[PDB]
C-alpha cells in the first residue's frame, strides 16, 4: 500500500518540521524567552530538524521500493548519519533534564554557572558525543556486528535513560515536601508524561535490537513496527517540553 | 567613525547586564514607629543597603523617606524578589499624633492590605517581622488587649495574645494561592535567607511546570 | 493657619484681573497658523524620498 | 476670620468662572467645521535602537536633529546617533532610579535625575577625554519628575515635593522657587520664547509661571484625575495636557478655557506622553494600551496609529525640523518613525 506508507511518513515530516521550526523562531523573537537555558530547546530542535528532512526520506525509499538502494557509497554517509541524528536528540534530553535538576536542588549556588559560556560548552559537548558513536539488488541493513550493535545501544539509550529517571524521581521528592500547597496532583502528572512518552516511544527498538545480538530471534514484523517508533519521538519533543511552561505559550501567540 | 563606535560601546553594555543582574533585590516598608530603624542595623530619597550572607548578594532598598504619593513610584519596584514589612507589637495602645481615636496598630493593617493585595506584586512573597515583643508582655499584663481588639477575648500572656495578632495579619492576604507570607518575631538575618531560597526554588520549579 | 489664607485670597485677586479675548478670535489664530506652515511639515505632507535621511539618503 | 477668608475666596471663584463664560463664543467644532481632513497618516518604523536592558523612562532629542539621549532602569544613559544607530557615548548613572533626561540647546552637556532628589549635570565635551560630572543641583525634598534647560547656563526642574525651581548652573543654587501646587508635580514645558513655562500636578490642575519673576499668572482645571504630560503649541499661545482620566485637552492662554477634548469610548487607559508636530496640525499621544494614537488637533479625530511596542509607551518626542518621531517603552526598545 504505497498510499498509506508514503502519506503517513509525510505526516511525520510535516509535524517534525512544524514543531521544531516554530520553537526556534519563538526563542529568537521574544525577550521573555531570553534565558540562557533556553538554548537547549534550540539545539535539540536542530538535531530533530535534520533527521526529518534527511533520514526519513531515504529510509522511506528503502521500505516502499522494496528491492535495493540507489547507490553504494552514500550508505556510509547515510546509515551513519541516521544514527547520529537519533543519538543527538535523546542526548539533548539529558541536558535539559540535568539543567532543571541543579536549578531545583542547588538553586542559590546555581544562580551563577548559568552563563552562555557554560551553556555553549554543553551543546558543543552534546553534538561531539553523538559524532563519536555515529562514525566509528544489494540492500541496506543496519549494522549487524555483535560488538557495535550492543555497544551503541548502551551508549545511546540505556545510559541516557538511567539519568532521566534518577533525576525525575529526586525532583519528585523535592516538590512534594516543598510545596505542601494541596497541589499534589499537579507535579505528578507532569513527571509521568515526560518519562512515559520517552520510554514507550524508544524502549521497544533498543530492547528488541539488543536481543537480536546476543543470539535470539525476533519477528521481522514487530521489529519494523518498533523501528519507526523512534522517529515519532522527534515530533513529540516540542510538545512535552514546552507546553507546561506559561512563557512559551505567550510567545507562541506572538507569532500565531 | 559611527560604525566603530557602537561596537566598542555595546560590548560594554551586555558586559554590564549579565554582570549586574545576579544580585538579590528587596524592598523595605513599614511605618515611622515600626522597627525599620532597628532591623537594618542588625542585618535623600531612596536609600540602598548592601550585605552578604553565605555567598549571596543582597540589595535592600529603603523607601521610607519618600513622603509623596505612593502610586506614582511603586511601579518602579516590580520585579524584586520579596517585600520586607516591619511591624511593632507594642503599639496596640498608642494613638497617632496628627489624628486621635486611631491606633498605630490599625494603621499598619492598612499598609499591609495595600501591598499584599496589589496589582504590581501579585506573585511576590512578603516577609513580615513583628517587633518589640520585649515590651509587649509588659503592657499586656497591665493594659488589657481589649483596648485595641474588642473581639480578642482570651487569657492574656506572652504567647497567647501575641499569636492572635499573626492571624489578623495573615487573614488580610487575599492571594492565598499565588503568594505566601513568612512571619517572624524579631536568627533575623537567617529567616530572610531561609525564606529567599524557598522563593527561588519555587520559581525554578515553576519553569518546569511542576507548580 | 491665617497667614496662608491671606496669601490665597491675594493670588485669586490678582488672577481675576487679566484681560481676555474671545474664543473665536482664539481659534482663528490657531487655525490660521497651521494653514500657513502646512507646507514645511514633512509628517503631514510626505517628503520626496531623495531627502529623507531615515528612509533613503546620505546618513550624514 | 476664617469665614472672611473663605467668603472672599468663594466669591472670587464665582467671578472667575463667569468671566470665562462671557468669553465663550463658539467651540472649535464650528469654526473648524468646514476644514479639510488630514486624511489617514501612515508612519512606518525606519530605525530601531537596541541596547537598553531594562525599561525606558525618558528620552530627548538634540537641536542638531540627528542626536538623541535616553534613560533606563539599567542605570545607563546613552547618546545615540539616529542616522547610523551608533552609540556616541554611554554614561554610568550613580543612581538607578532615573526618571528624566535632558540635552542642552548648546549641546555640550546633559542632565539626569530620579528618586535621588538631586539633578546631575554631565559634560559632553571635556576637551581631554570622556564625560565628567561637572555639577550637582540638590534642594528638592521629593523625587525629580522633570527637568529642562532654559539656556546654556540655567535649568528648571520639577519635583514631587509639590514645587518647581529655577536654578542657575555653575553655582548650584535656586535662583527662584515656584510654589502654589497642592499635589505632586509631574511635568513641565518651556515656551519657545523661553520666558514662560507650564506644569502639571496630581491636584488635577496646571499653572503658568513667569520665569523671571517667580510669579504664577493663571491656573487651568477641568481634568478629573492626575495629569501626566504637557506640551506647548509651536507658537506658544496654547498647550495640551494628558491625564489618567484617559483624555487629552487643549487650553488657550488668551481665552483661559478648554478648547478641545481628544477622547474615545474604547480608551480606558491613561495617556503617558503628548507632543505636537512641527506645524502643530497633529497631536501624538502615548498610552498604556501599548500604542500611540495620532490626533487631528483642529478636528479631534484619530488620524493614524503607531502600534509597534509590546509594553506601554512611556516617552515620545519630535524633531525641530519635523522629520522623525521617536517613541520609547518598557520593552527596552526605542523606535524612529520617520
Ligand atoms: C529508528 N532509527 C534509529 C537508528 O536505527 C539508530 C539510532 C541510534 C542508534 O544508536 C542506532 O544504533 C540506530
Count of separate structural domains of chain C: 1
- Specify the CATH class of chain C: Few Secondary Structures
Q: Which pair of chains forms the biggest interface, and how many residues does each contribute?
A: C-D, 38 and 59 residues
Q: What summary fits the major beta sheet of chain C? A: none
CATH third-level topology of chain C: G Protein Gi Gamma 2
| CATH architecture verdict of chain B | 3-Layer(aba) Sandwich
* Strand arrangement across the biggest beta sheet of chain B: 2-3-1-4-5-6
Overall strand count of chain C:
0
Radius of gyration of chain B: 20 Å
Task: Kindly report how far apart the N and C termini of chain B lie.
Answer: 52 Å
Distance between the termini of chain C: 62 Å
- Rg from alpha-carbon coordinates of chain C: 24 Å
Order of helices and strands of chain B: HHEHEEEHEHHEH
Query: How does the helix and strand content of chain C classify structurally?
Result: mainly alpha
**Judging from the principal axes of the Cα atoms, what is the shape of chain C?**
elongated
PDB class: signaling protein
Keywords: GPCR, Adrenergic Receptor, signaling protein
Assembly: tetrameric
Entry title: Cryo-EM structure of epinephrine-bound alpha-2A-adrenergic receptor in complex with heterotrimeric Gi-protein
Amino acid at each position: 500500500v504505497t498510499l498509506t506508507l508514503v502519506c503517513l511518513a509525510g505526516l511525520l515530516m510535516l509535524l517534525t518540521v512544524f514543531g521544531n521550526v516554530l520553537v526556534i523562531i519563538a526563542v529568537f523573537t521574544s525577550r521573555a524567552l531570553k534565558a540562557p537555558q533556553n538554548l537547549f530547546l534550540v539545539s535539540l530542535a536542530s538535531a530533530d530538524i535534520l533527521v526529518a528532512t534527511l533520514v526519513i526520506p531515504f529510509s522511506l525509499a528503502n521500505e516502499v521500493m522494496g528491492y535495493w538502494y540507489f547507490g553504494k557509497a552514500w550508505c556510509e554517509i547515510y546509515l551513519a548519519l541516521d544514527v547520529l541524528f537519533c543519538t543527538s536528540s535523546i542526548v539533548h534530553l539529558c541536558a535539559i533534564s540535568l539543567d532543571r535538576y541543579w536549578s531545583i536542588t542547588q538553586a542559590i549556588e546555581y544562580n551563577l554557572k548559568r552563563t552562555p559560556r557554560r551553556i555553549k560548552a554543553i551543546i558543543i559537548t552534546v553534538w561531539v558525543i553523538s559524532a563519536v558513536i555515529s562514525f566509528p539488488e544489494p540492500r541496506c541493513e543496519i549494522n549487524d556486528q555483535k560488538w557495535y550493535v550492543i555497544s551503541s545501544c548502551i551508549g545511546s539509550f540505556f545510559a541516557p535513560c538511567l539519568i532521566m529517571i534518577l533525576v525525575y524521581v529526586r525532583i519528585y521528592q523535592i516538590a512534594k515536601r516543598r510545596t505542601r500547597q494541596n497541589r499534589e496532583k499537579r507535579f505528578t502528572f507532569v513527571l509521568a508524561v515526560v518519562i512515559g512518552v520517552f520510554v514507550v516511544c524508544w524502549f521497544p527498538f533498543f530492547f528488541t535490537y539488543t536481543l537480536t545480538a546476543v543470539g535470539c530471534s525476533v519477528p521481522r514484523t514487530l521489529f519494523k513496527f518498533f523501528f519507526w517508533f523512534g522517529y515519532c519521538n522527534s515530533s513529540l519533543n516540542p510538545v512535552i517540553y514546552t507546553i507546561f511552561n506559561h512563557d512559551f505559550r505567550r510567545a507562541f501567540k506572538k507569532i500565531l | 567613525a559611527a560604525v566603530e563606535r557602537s561596537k566598542m560601546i555595546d560590548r560594554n553594555l551586555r558586559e554590564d547586564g549579565e554582570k549586574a543582574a545576579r544580585e538579590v533585590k528587596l524592598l523595605l516598608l513599614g511605618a515611622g514607629e515600626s522597627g525599620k530603624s532597628t532591623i537594618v542595623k542588625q542585618m535623600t530619597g531612596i536609600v540602598e543597603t548592601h550585605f552578604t550572607f553565605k555567598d549571596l548578594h543582597f540589595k535592600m532598598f529603603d523607601v521610607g523617606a519618600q513622603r509623596s504619593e505612593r502610586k506614582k513610584w511603586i511601579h518602579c519596584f516590580e520585579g524584586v524578589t520579596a517585600i520586607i514589612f516591619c511591624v511593632a507589637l507594642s503599639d496596640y495602645d498608642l494613638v497617632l499624633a496628627e489624628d486621635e481615636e486611631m491606633n498605630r496598630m490599625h494603621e499598619s493593617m492598612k499598609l499591609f492590605d495595600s501591598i499584599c493585595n496589589n496589582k504590581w506584586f501579585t506573585d511576590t512573597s512578603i516577609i513580615l517581622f513583628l517587633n518589640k515583643k520585649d515590651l509587649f508582655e509588659e503592657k499586656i499584663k497591665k493594659s488589657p488587649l481589649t483596648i485595641c481588639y474588642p473581639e480578642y477575648a482570651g487569657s492574656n500572656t506572652y504567647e497567647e495574645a501575641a499569636a492572635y495578632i499573626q492571624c489578623q495579619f495573615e487573614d488580610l492576604n487575599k492571594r492565598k494561592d499565588t503568594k505566601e507570607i513568612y512571619t517572624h518575631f524579631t536568627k533575623n538575618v537567617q529567616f530572610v535567607f531561609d525564606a529567599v531560597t524557598d522563593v527561588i526554588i519555587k520559581n525554578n520549579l515553576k519553569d518546569c511546570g511542576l507548580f | 493657619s491665617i497667614a496662608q489664607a491671606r496669601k490665597l485670597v491675594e493670588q485669586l485677586k490678582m488672577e481675576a484681573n487679566i484681560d481676555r479675548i474671545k474664543v473665536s478670535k482664539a481659534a482663528a489664530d490657531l487655525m490660521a497658523y497651521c494653514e500657513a506652515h502646512a507646507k514645511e511639515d514633512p509628517l503631514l505632507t510626505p517628503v520626496p524620498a531623495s531627502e529623507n535621511p531615515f528612509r533613503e539618503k546620505k546618513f550624514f | 476670620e476664617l469665614d472672611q477668608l473663605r467668603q472672599e475666596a468663594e466669591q472670587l471663584k464665582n467671578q472667575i468662572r463667569d468671566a470665562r463664560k462671557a468669553c465663550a463664543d463658539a467651540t472649535l467644532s464650528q469654526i473648524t467645521n468646514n476644514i479639510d481632513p488630514v486624511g489617514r497618516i501612515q508612519m512606518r518604523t525606519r530605525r530601531t535602537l537596541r541596547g537598553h536592558l531594562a525599561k525606558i523612562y525618558a528620552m530627548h532629542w538634540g537641536t542638531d536633529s540627528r542626536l538623541l539621549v535616553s534613560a533606563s532602569q539599567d542605570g545607563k544613559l546613552i547618546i545615540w546617533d539616529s542616522y547610523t544607530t551608533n552609540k556616541v557615548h554611554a554614561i554610568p548613572l550613580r543612581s538607578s532610579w532615573v526618571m528624566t533626561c535632558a540635552y542642552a540647546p548648546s549641546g555640550n552637556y546633559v542632565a539626569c535625575g530620579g528618586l535621588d532628589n538631586i539633578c546631575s549635570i554631565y559634560n559632553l565635551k571635556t576637551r581631554e577625554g570622556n564625560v565628567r560630572v561637572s555639577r550637582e543641583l540638590a534642594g528638592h525634598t521629593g523625587y525629580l519628575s522633570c527637568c529642562r534647560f532654559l539656556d546654556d547656563n540655567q535649568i528648571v526642574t520639577s519635583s514631587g515635593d509639590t514645587t518647581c525651581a529655577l536654578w542657575d548652573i555653575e553655582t548650584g543654587q535656586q535662583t527662584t522657587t515656584f510654589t502654589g501646587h497642592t499635589g505632586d508635580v509631574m511635568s513641565l514645558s518651556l515656551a519657545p520664547d523661553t520666558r514662560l513655562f507650564v506644569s502639571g500636578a496630581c491636584d488635577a490642575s496646571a499653572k503658568l509661571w513667569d520665569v523671571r519673576e517667580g510669579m504664577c499668572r493663571q491656573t487651568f482645571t477641568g481634568h478629573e484625575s492626575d495629569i501626566n504630560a504637557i506640551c506647548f503649541f509651536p507658537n506658544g499661545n496654547a498647550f495640551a495636557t494628558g491625564s489618567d482620566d484617559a483624555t487629552c485637552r487643549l487650553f488657550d492662554l488668551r481665552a483661559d478655557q478648554e478648547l478641545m477634548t481628544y477622547s474615545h469610548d474604547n480608551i480606558i487607559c491613561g495617556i503617558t506622553s503628548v507632543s505636537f508636530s512641527k506645524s502643530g496640525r497633529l497631536l501624538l499621544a502615548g498610552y498604556d494600551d501599548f500604542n500611540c494614537n495620532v490626533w487631528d488637533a483642529l478636528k479631534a479625530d484619530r488620524a493614524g496609529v503607531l502600534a509597534g511596542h509590546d509594553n506601554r509607551v512611556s516617552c515620545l518626542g519630535v524633531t525641530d525640523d519635523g522629520m522623525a518621531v521617536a517613541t520609547g517603552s518598557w520593552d527596552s526598545f526605542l523606535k524612529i518613525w520617520n
